[PDB]
Amino acid sequence: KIVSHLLVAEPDKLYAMPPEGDIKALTTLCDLADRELVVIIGWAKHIPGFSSLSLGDQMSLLQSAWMEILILGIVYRSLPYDDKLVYAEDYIMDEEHSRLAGLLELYRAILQLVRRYKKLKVEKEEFVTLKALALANSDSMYIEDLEAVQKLQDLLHEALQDYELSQRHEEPWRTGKLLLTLPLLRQTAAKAVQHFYSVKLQGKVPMHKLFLEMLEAK
């Protein structure tokens, strides 16, 4: 099974480790992002067939899909909370905390995806196969071998569908319902990327260099 496989490759629980203003909040998220960026990359290589792609294509996918995969981590962690965003198990933002630190509009955007996933009652197994699917479905304009990337997409999609066609056969077309959240996923990731590039430009906030490198690709 690819799901059991992709599942135990996921990192273990993350903990925030950060003048208590807006500039200290952004830094905590920016370094939580950079720390998980590092872990996506470790995790990506466990996706079957991902490492058999040419390195340029592995980078093209990651460069397109990285924020989508982070957002899906925040979403998964946030499912049990009452309109809270858990960037980490340590670090759980609400509306007022968000608004003060300038993150309100981003906060509302992610919460919309959170509330959609709460109603779908998405499981850890589905988050994992969906993270993988967002990676292979990134739509990078810089892929050299579209056919190999499509094969991966077909594989991850098969997995998601065959996982659903048994573990959750009580609910029909539950696969498609999860796929139908992907546009909002990409949309929300677009808002996060612009906001975080907006604090990149401002310069008042420091960013570990892997995070910065991903942000300028976008």
Binding site: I41, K45, E213
Partner: peptide
């Protein structure tokens, strides 16, 4: 030269 390729081939 990129951090990404560093982390991708570690």
């Amino acid at each position: 030269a990129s951090e990404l390729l560093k982390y991708l081939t570690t």
